[PDB]
From a paper:
The cytochrome bc 1 complex, also known as respiratory complex III (CIII), in the electron-transfer chain of the inner mitochondrial membrane is a homodimer (CIII2) of two biochemically identical protomers. CIII2 catalyses the transfer of electrons from the lipophilic two-electron donor ubiquinol (QH2) to the water-soluble, one-electron acceptor protein cytochrome c, contributing to an electrochemical proton gradient across the membrane. Electron transfer within the complex occurs through the prosthetic groups of the three catalytic core subunits: heme b L and heme b H of cytochrome b (cyt b), heme c 1 of cytochrome c 1 (cyt c 1) and the [2Fe–2S] cluster of the iron–sulfur protein (ISP), often called the Rieske protein after its discoverer. The Rieske domain is tethered to the complex by one transmembrane helix and a connecting flexible linker that acts as a hinge.
(v) +Atovaquone+antimycin A: with the Pf-type inhibitor atovaquone and the Qi-site inhibitor antimycin A. In crystallographic studies, problems of domain mobility can be overcome by Pf-type inhibitors, which fix the Rieske domain in the b position where its cluster-bearing tip is tightly docked to the surface of cyt b. The poor solubility of DQ limited the accessible concentration range, which may explain why we did not observe density in the Qi site in the consensus refinements. Atovaquone was resolved in the Qo site in the +atovaquone+antimycin A sample, with the Rieske domain fixed in the b position [Fig. 1(d)]. Atovaquone induced very tight binding of the tip of the Rieske domain to cyt b. As expected for a Pf-type inhibitor, the hinge region that tethers the mobile Rieske domain to the transmembrane domain was in an extended conformation. Together with the widening of the docking crater, this allowed close association of the Rieske domain with cyt b. Atovaquone formed a hydrogen bond to the cluster-ligating His190 (2.8 Å). In addition, Cys189, His170 and Leu171 of the Rieske domain formed hydrogen bonds to Tyr279, Lys288 and Asn149 of cyt b, as previously observed. These inter­actions stabilized the whole Rieske domain, improving the local resolution. As expected, the Rieske domain was mobile and thus poorly resolved, except when the Pf-type inhibitor atovaquone was added to arrest the domain at the surface of cyt b.
Numbering used by the authors:
A (entry chain B): 15 to 416
B (entry chain A): 26 to 248, 260 to 474
C (entry chain J): 8 to 82
D (entry chain E): 39 to 57
E (entry chain N): 1 to 55
F (entry chain R): 2 to 125
G (entry chain N): 111 to 383
The structure:
């Protein structure tokens, strides 16, 4: 991705040999920047609604004539709007993003009838997975505000059209926009973005209201639709070793119909439960989570004990073999992340919008057993452990039990 | 312009097909087999799926645990799926981990232990899978749809097989199955991503050279299906959403009408109320359904097999009192494929497909799945230029001709699952397959 | 590179356009034949229909040329 | 009796040339 | 629930002549509908009666 | 006829200096004689609403404007049945006769007519 | 539009019922009326003349015709009551309109007691007018000639149909062509079917449309003028006058209403800005 600049907008493109271009506008407008709860999700779903030049209807019907697709998501850090189209149709999609950032008519009816109902369906579909809810709840406990704001719009806290319009005034500005083109000729994109986003506000860098504070605690979301448990440990100093530790501890199977040879995977033997260790870097804070879903609260409780034991055992001793297995699983995770278009866009988005150089998969650091055991030790000896239980919460573990 | 798909053969008849992408750092190698559940008879139905479990249950060299560790150490993952006509076994890894993965795949396919102890262990695991697919409503509908459309024929069988078979599958009949079916002339080793073709052919010469060849080597994607217009209703008032599939006998991979049927499928299109853009799609049915809140979703499909296919639509709806309207309007939209379509719909759908057929291939696993699917169904990879030419050849007249012979006034296979009290009886649904006004 | 999709709106009226209607022109033809055949069939009994239409048809038309002998006709 | 994927026997009624 | 609403036959009468919700401001020109109904009833009564006497 | 039609045609008239000079005074007198203001209506209260499009426009009204519309219609219905006219504050003053609904129906219809147009597009 | 369109058919059926009933007296006007109505189908080319004979069941109006008119006059009112019921059922989806032409969904009243008691006032006012005719002047609305028995050899020199058919009769007289005259007369009723199309107003009804109310006043008065011209002698200058009134009648639906309704739309919008 040759990072450049076109009329004050950061543009990253990587030419390829494919008939398919993905052009992504990454906005520094994720939930951590959210003025009110859920507004970044609403703003994401309000992209490609009616603009002044072109109605949502006309946009969608013309996009289908080029056979383009549109995909949007919100993270805690960014909103990503990605279009997938054929190489040749690049100018149209550049101009369409320009129309979205410059001239979206945020009309109250779109919010009532179109955007809010779809945002509500988006979140209900995600919550069908109790693991999602547990990890969302865990961020809420761990960070409270900022990173702790919910990513998604919920019914209990309504976003008004004034809230979304205010947020979009800040976000839709040269300072918070990165254009990332996968399989786009970098010279051609700079020229197009330079003509299309010239009249975009300069605006200001969106900032998090307040610095990131970490906290421990418990969240007990009573659902009837599956059971999950996150054991999260907020990190005050995000380090790349937690990626290695996440991949080492593992949890998912690397083979169909198997358990896996990862410590967390071996914690699920005898149970129809899954486990996944994940680490989320947010620049200034981090979250190491171990999420356990399953249908039996008794099994989840059983696994949760084994899971925290596994982390303590890692703090004791890692073998050289295990450390190499971690390097391999971590390099692989980095590679497939840079391949998947959704995550790719946000990776380079981070690099462009913040300044955090992307760690290329070929440059992922090899962590010694010393460094990994040290990292697991810090986590086992965390002063602020978070535990988010979802489902039959009366039967799931509590933080002080773990 | 995508890079050229290179193709080589071995002596035994194993095809190696590769598409390099020097822009990515991972690589998906795998083996696509032109064999699946369809290749069983009624006694050993479920064997192919059974094998998929046992493939990862250890080999003559590496045990189950050693296997697990070897792949963990590689860094990527292995994955397999058995369908009715195709079995796939692939390994996504890093660029320089490809020799390990080809070696592991060659081992699990040729030199699987299939130990009585492991057969007996999986016999419970697979039995439990029979009562957990129950939840995947899409799959329940489509499994019933095949069962009914191809009543008592090989395609009509499920993949998991009946409970009875799972209890009686022996290592003998598993061995016999993979000896008869997983032959070199029926397999394609596919590499996509950071693979060199010449390197992959060397790996195939090293690992897949002692593969059995079949006695009678037919070309890849070589097949007698007699579709049954029929319905299954699985009424379940406790379910909130009704899932209905309707299908007619569709087209095989090699049909002259294959592209015409895809175009037709794109004219009806898909719809999902959860996607923001879907209320604005051009599809007539999409407009009717969204304006009237008739469905949560519909998804046209055209599933093809070597010698037949199903073409149809899969609907989900919570509007349980207007399912009659939903089915009515859907089939009236199919009728208009026969009576009304003109250059307006056809050119719009062709434009949406010209992109769609290339959009699908966006990661190394999708590319590999496309290479593998095409090589095992057509015997060659069809280049984007040839695909664009075949689509351009589809005219409005061709779509009308195809619809009039395939859809219009034809028997349908209808499966309804859930609160489908409101779905009328078979006659009234089938009566909508024609228009008295035409 | 393509800057804009290339299309026109065809003239339309009450949701009919000439492409669509032109595909139905044959069908109106057949329904007009069905209405013609059917109408003529309904009035085949009407004496004027025989006199002026049906008796004029070659070969077949003799079916409708029937005279009552004046010996058997009171009127 | 149990499996819903084993369509009941329709051979007494099914026409061979149905299509 | 009121009989007039429960019973299918009464419910049809009810919906026309009793509970039928009408705008509150209809003026006297909305009365012709019922006069035409009355004419129609008179015509049927006198008509059938004349038919008993007419040849 | 569609509100779009009426609004575009009105805009053609208000553009042409000659036309506006002769039509605007006519229309103002017409509206005075129309006398809907004497029942406390705004012009837009009189638009036929039993149409898909209009029902959708009326659902889009802000709650405030919607509640007030209901009140004006109730009040006018009551004047009508009593054969009285509005007096005092109930009479719609020219400054209160705002086109509260026109923006909503024009948006509804804009989309509906675009939808009809795009249903008839021909790839070139 | 549906109750309206069903209504237009009720209006045609009433005309045919009332006419078929007129013929049953078999006075002079009765027989002649029968002749003319049964000859309107002669307008229909080719088959026309044969249909006429078929509807008479003879070569002239005679016994056969009178007996079939009796059968149908008895029947037609029950058909008319069906259609009257149907147009109410069609109306029940939208409910009655109201004199403001706004929705009434905001303010509804039960049919009873309010309109039941309101309808009694007109029942009694109707019966007062009924009583004055029936008891005091039963023959004011009748034609003397119907008290002469039917003589197929003469038609009265003063042919004037029922007061209510007079408007369409003047229309039929106006047009000097056979088929023309018949078409125009039927079209004068069937043209009501197009009001839903040709009224281009965005506003329902005329309470608030001064120009439309004036146009409607002239249309109604013209329909009354046609009525009057239906009963004068066919002489100058009423021949030309009847033609002008016929053109005005049709031009209301075809020209004036579409134009006036378009202009008033614009006047409402401009006038209220
Ligand atoms: C036949 C069988 C007999 C049954 C009788 C039924 C007739 C009743 C009916 O419908 O008319 C009464 C009807 C009274 O009805 P209403 O409900 O009080 O008001 C109806 C009008 O819409 C209300 O109209 P408005 O409020 O504008 O009042 C108008 C009316 C004043 O209305 C009066 O009541 C007098 O005055 C005139 O229009 C007369 C014109 C000037 C003549 C010089 O009289 C009229 O208004 C007739 C005006 C027609 C011209
Ligand atoms: C004779 C001339 C007719 C002119 C009528 C013009 C309106 C008028 O002043 O009438 C008073 C009233 C005016 O009522 P309105 O409802 O418009 O006004 C009420 C008062 N405001 C405006 C404040 C709400 O009109 C009617 O009630 C008219 C009913 C029409 C009946 C016509 C019968 C003729 C038959 C021919 C059939 C073909
Ligand atoms: C000709 C017919 C006229 C004679 C009947 C009129 C009613 C006689 C007096 C009785 C009366 O006023 O009492 C009410 C009966 O009215 C009723 O229940 C009916 C009210 C009006 C009678 C007819 C309705 C006409 C409306 C449509 C006309 C259709 C014409 C077609 C032929 C009941 O008083 P209450 O029920 O209000 O309650 C009050 C407490 N119980
Ligand atoms: C036997 C003759 C008829 C009877 C008994 C009859 C009766 C009625 C009644 C009771 C109503 C509802 C109350 C009212 O509005 O007055 C009504 C409404 C209506 N009638 Fe008639 N009607 C007859 C003939 C006609 C004709 C000939 C037409 C049209 C040409 C017509 C059109 C309508 C319409 C459009 C309505 C709805 C009007 C509204 O309430 O705004 N009817 N009729
Ligand atoms: C809409 C309903 C009806 C209308 C408009 C209607 C109209 C008429 C008219 C105008 C006459 C000529 C009356 C005269 O000048 O003497 C008449 C006669 C007659 N009607 Fe009706 N009629 C209706 C319903 C009925 C019904 C239901 C019957 C049932 C048989 C009937 C039986 C008669 C009979 C027997 C005569 C001839 C005796 C006579 O002239 O009085 N009518 N009708
Ligand atoms: C003897 C019986 C006669 C029955 C005649 C039926 C004629 C039906 C014709 C018809 O439905 O045409 C539809 C066609 C337009 O198609 P669409 O927009 O309804 O698809 O409509 C137009 O093209 C106009
Ligand atoms: C006994 C139940 C059978 C249902 C049908 C009987 C009649 C029926 O429904 O009566 C109702 C009272 C109706 N009036 C109204 O809608 C009405 C509505 C609003 C305002 C007023 N008045 C205003 O001030 C009304 O008057 C009416 O007069 O219509 C007759 C014609 C109906 O006859 C038939 O269709 C069948 C047949 C005898 C014609
Ligand atoms: C002499 C002829 C014999 C039958 C004539 C009697 C009256 C005509 C009835 C036919 C119309 C019935 O058609 C249907 O009936 C139902 C049953 O009340 C009515 O239904 C109406 O009232 C009911 C309750 O009162 C409501 O739930 C409903 O929302 C409303 O539409 C309506 O009127 C009409 O939707
Ligand atoms: O010449 C006529 C004549 O024209 C009508 C006429 C007037 C109304 C016509 C009519 C009006 C409207 C319709 Cl929808 C159908 C017929 C029917 C024929 C008569 O009723 C008449 C009665 C007695 C003697 C002569 C005559």
């Amino acid at each position: 991705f040759s990072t450049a600049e076109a009329a004050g907008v950061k543009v990253a493109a990587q030419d390829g040999q494919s008939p398919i271009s993905d052009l992504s506008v990454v906005l520094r407008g994720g939930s951590r920047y959210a003025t009110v709860p859920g507004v970044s999700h609403i703003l994401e779903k309000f992209a490609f609604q009616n603009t002044v030049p072109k109605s949502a209807l006309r946009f969608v019907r013309e996009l289908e004539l080029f056979g383009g697709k549109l995909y949007t998501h919100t993270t805690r850090e960014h909103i990503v709007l990605r279009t997938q189209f054929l190489k040749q149709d690049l100018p149209y999609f550049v101009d369409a993003f320009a129309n979205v950032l410059k001239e979206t008519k945020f009309q109250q009816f779109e919010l009532t009838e179109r955007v809010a109902p779809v945002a509500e369906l988006d979140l209900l579909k995600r919550e069908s997975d109790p693991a999602f809810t547990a990890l969302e709840a865990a961020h809420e406990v761990a960070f409270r505000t900022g990173l702790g704001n919910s990513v998604y719009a919920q019914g209990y806290s309504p976003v008004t059209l004034e809230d979304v319009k205010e947020f979009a005034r800040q976000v839709y500005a040269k300072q918070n926009v990165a254009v990332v083109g996968n399989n786009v000729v970098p010279a051609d994109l700079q020229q197009l973005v330079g003509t299309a986003f010239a009249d975009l506000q300069e605006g200001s860098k969106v900032t998090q209201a307040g610095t990131t504070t970490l906290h421990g605690g418990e969240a007990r979301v009573r659902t009837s639709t599956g059971n999950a448990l996150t054991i999260a440990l907020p990190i005050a100093e995000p380090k790349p070793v937690y990626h290695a530790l996440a991949s080492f501890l593992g949890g998912p199977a690397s083979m169909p119909w198997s358990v896996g040879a990862s410590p967390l995977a071996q914690a699920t033997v005898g149970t129809h439960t899954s486990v996944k260790a994940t680490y989320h870097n947010y620049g200034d804070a981090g979250l190491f989570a171990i999420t356990i879903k399953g249908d039996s609260p008794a099994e989840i409780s059983q696994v949760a004990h084994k899971a925290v034991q596994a982390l303590k055992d890692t703090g004791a001793e890692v073998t050289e073999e295990q450390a190499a297995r971690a390097y391999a699983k971590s390099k692989f995770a980095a590679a497939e992340a840079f391949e998947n278009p959704d995550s790719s866009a946000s990776v380079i988005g981070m690099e462009l919008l913040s300044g955090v150089s992307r760690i290329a998969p070929e440059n992922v650091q090899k962590f010694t057993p010393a460094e990994l055991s040290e990292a697991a030790a810090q986590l086992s000896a965390s002063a602020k452990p978070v535990v988010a239980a979802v489902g039959q919460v009366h039967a799931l573990p509590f933080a002080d039990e773990l | 312009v995508s890079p050229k798909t290179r193709t080589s053969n071995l002596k035994n008849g194993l095809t190696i097909a590769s598409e390099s992408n020097p822009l990515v750092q991972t690589a998906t190698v795998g083996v696509w087999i032109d064999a699946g559940s369809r290749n069983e008879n009624a006694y050993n139905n479920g064997t192919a799926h059974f094998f998929e479990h046992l493939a990862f249950k250890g080999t003559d060299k590496r045990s189950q645990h050693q296997l697990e560790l070897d792949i963990e150490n590689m860094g990527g993952h292995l994955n397999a799926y058995t369908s009715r006509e195709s079995t796939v076994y692939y390994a996504k890894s890093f660029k320089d981990d490809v020799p390990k993965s080809v070696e592991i795949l060659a081992d699990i396919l040729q030199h699987s232990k299939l130990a009585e102890s492991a057969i007996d262990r999986e016999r419970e695991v697979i039995t439990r899978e029979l009562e957990e697919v129950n939840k995947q409503y899409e799959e329940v509908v489509f499994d019933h749809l095949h069962a009914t459309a191809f009543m008592n024929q090989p395609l009509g069988r499920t993949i998991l097989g009946p409970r009875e078979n799972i209890q009686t599958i022996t290592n003998t009949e598993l061995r016999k199955f993979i000896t008869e079916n997983y032959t070199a002339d029926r397999m394609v080793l596919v590499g996509a991503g950071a693979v060199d073709h010449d390197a992959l052919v060397e790996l195939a010469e090293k690992y897949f050279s002692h593969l059995p060849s079949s006695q009678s080597p037919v070309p890849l994607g070589t097949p007698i299906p007699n579709f049954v217009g029929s319905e299954v209703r699985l009424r379940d008032d406790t379910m909130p959403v009704a899932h209905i599939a309707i299908a007619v006998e569709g087209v095989s991979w090699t049909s002259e009408d294959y592209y015409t049927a895809l175009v037709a499928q794109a004219i009806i299109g898909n719809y999902d109320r959860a996607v923001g853009t879907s209320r604005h799609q051009g599809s007539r049915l999409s407009n009717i359904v969204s304006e009237n809140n008739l469905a949560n979703s519909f998804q046209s499909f055209s599933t093809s097999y070597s010698d037949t296919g199903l073409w149809g639509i899969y609907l989900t709806s919570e509007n349980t009192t207007q399912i009659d309207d939903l089915v009515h309007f859907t089939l009236k939209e199919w009728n208009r494929l026969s009576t009304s379509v003109s250059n307006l719909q056809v050119e719009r759908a062709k434009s949406q497909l010209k992109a769609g057929l290339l959009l699908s291939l966006d990661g190394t696993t999708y590319v590999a799945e496309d290479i593998g699917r095409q090589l095992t169904t057509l015997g060659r990879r069809v280049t984007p230029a040839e695909v664009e030419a075949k689509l351009e050849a589809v005219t409005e007249h061709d779509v009308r001709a195809w619809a009039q012979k395939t859809l219009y006034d034809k028997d349908i296979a209808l499966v309804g699952l859930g609160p489908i009290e409101g779905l009328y009886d078979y006659n009234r649904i089938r009566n909508d397959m024609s228009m008295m006004r035409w | 590179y393509v800057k804009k999709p290339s299309y026109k709106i065809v003239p339309h009226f009450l949701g009919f356009n000439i492409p669509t209607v032109s595909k139905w022109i044959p069908i109106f033809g057949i329904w007009g034949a069905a209405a013609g055949i059917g109408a003529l069939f309904l009035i085949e009994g009407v004496p004027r229909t025989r006199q002026d239409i049906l008796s004029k048809i070659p070969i077949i038309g003799e079916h409708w040329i029937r005279e009552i002998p004046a010996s058997d006709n009171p009127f | 009796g149990k499996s819903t994927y084993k369509i009941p026997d329709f051979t007494p009624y099914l026409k061979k040339d149905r299509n | 629930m009121a009989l007039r609403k429960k019973n299918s036959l009464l419910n049809m009468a009810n919906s026309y002549v009793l509970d039928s919700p009408q705008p509150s401001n209809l003026n006297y020109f909305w009365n012709f509908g019922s006069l035409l109904a009355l004419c129609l009833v008179i015509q049927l009564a006198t008509g059938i009666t004349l038919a008993m006497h007419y040849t | 006829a569609s509100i779009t039609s009426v609004v575009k045609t009105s805009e053609l008239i208000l553009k042409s200096p000659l036309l506006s000079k002769i039509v605007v005074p006519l229309a103002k007198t017409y509206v005075k004689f129309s006398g809907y203001r004497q029942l406390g209506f705004k012009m837009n209260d009189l638009i036929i609403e039993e149409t898909p499009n209009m029902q959708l426009a009326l659902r889009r009204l802000p709650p405030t404007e919607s509640y007030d519309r209901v009140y004006r219609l109730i009040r006018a219905t009551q004047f009508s049945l009593s054969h009285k006219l509005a007096t005092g504050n109930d009479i719609t003053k020219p400054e209160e006769d705002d086109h509260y609904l026109i923006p909503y129906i024009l948006d509804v219809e804009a989309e509906a007519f675009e939808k009809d147009a795009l249903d008839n597009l021909e790839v070139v | 539009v549906l109750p309206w369109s069903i209504g237009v058919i009720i209006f045609l059926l009433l005309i045919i019922t009332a006419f078929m009933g007129y013929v049953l007296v078999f006075g002079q006007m009765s027989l002649w009326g029968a002749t003319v109505i049964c000859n309107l189908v002669s307008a229909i080319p080719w088959l026309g003349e044969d249909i006429v004979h078929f509807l008479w069941g003879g070569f002239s109006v005679g016994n056969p015709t009178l007996q079939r008119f009796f059968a149908l006059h008895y029947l037609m009112p029950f058909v008319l009551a069906v259609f009257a019921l149907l147009h109410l059922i069609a109306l029940h989806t939208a409910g009655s309109s109201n004199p403001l032409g706004i929705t009434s969904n905001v303010d509804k009243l039960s049919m009873h007691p309010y309109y039941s008691f309101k309808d009694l006032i007109t029942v009694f006012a109707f019966l007062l007018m009924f009583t004055l005719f029936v008891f005091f002047s039963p023959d004011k609305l009748g034609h003397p000639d119907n008290y002469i028995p039917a003589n197929p050899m003469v038609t009265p020199a003063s042919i004037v149909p029922e007061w209510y058919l007079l408007p369409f009769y003047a229309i039929l007289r106006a047009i000097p062509d056979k088929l023309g005259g018949v078409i125009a007369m039927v079209a004068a009723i069937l043209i009501l079917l197009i009001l839903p199309i040709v009224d281009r107003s965005i506003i329902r009804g005329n309470a608030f449309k001064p120009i439309s109310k004036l146009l409607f006043g002239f249309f109604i008065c013209n329909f009354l003028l046609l009525g009057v011209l239906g009963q004068v002698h066919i002489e100058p200058p009423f021949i030309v006058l009847g033609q002008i009134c016929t053109i005005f009648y049709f031009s209301y639906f075809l020209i004036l209403l579409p134009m006036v309704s378009t202009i008033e739309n614009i006047f409402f919008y401009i006038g209220s800005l």
